[PDB]
Amino acid sequence: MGDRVEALAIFRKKQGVLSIDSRLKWTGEGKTTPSVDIAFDAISNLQTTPASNPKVMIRVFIVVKEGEDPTSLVFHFTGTPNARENCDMITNELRNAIQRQREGSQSK
């Protein structure tokens, strides 16, 4: 909500739109259902490409959202025309909103 940012990326050889609305939601190509729906409470941290890299990507480290186990997902913006710019847009709002939830969930 407001943190809504879009950037398509390749998730497990799937090139779809990566969206951010309180919950990090990535969706595959030609799909109405999100393939990566993980809330910020299930995002412990993430690693993104250092900008100066042809293979622009976004990696997310998932905390265990009751129901599964801790995992790490990768969204390759490498196959995206605006990989880095959207990657930054995603990462910045993503990381900001992810921590934003932590502010009211944990003491720090």
Q: How far is CA 86 from CA 9, 70, 78, 98, 108, in A?
A: 10, 26, 11, 17, 29
What 8-state DSSP symbol labels residue 13?
Answer: S
Phi, psi dihedrals of residue 60, rounded to the nearest 5°: -125, 135
Q: How far is CA 39 from CA 20, 42, 61, 107, in A?
A: 9, 5, 11, 19
Q: Which experimental approach was used here? A: NMR
d(C-alpha 87, C-alpha 79), whole Å = 12
What 8-state DSSP symbol labels residue 108?
Answer: -
* Cβ within 8 Å of residue 18, ≥6 positions away: 6, 7, 8, 9, 11, 24, 25, 26, 27, 36, 58, 75, 77, 86, 90
Please list, residue by residue across 2-30, b when 16 or more beta carbons sit within 10 angstroms of its beta carbon and e when fewer do. Answer: ebebebbbbbeebbbbbbbebbbbbbbee
Contact 38, 50 (CB under 8 A): no
List the domains of the chain with CATH numbers: 6-103 (2.30.29.30)
Contact 14, 36 (CB under 8 A): no
| Joined tokens for residue 59 | 């990696």
Helix (H, G, I), strand (E, B), or coil: what is residue 99?
Answer: helix
* Cβ within 8 Å of residue 84, ≥6 positions away: 49, 51, 56, 77
- Residue 5: closest CA among 97, 102, 103: 97
| Joined tokens for residue 39 | 């809330």
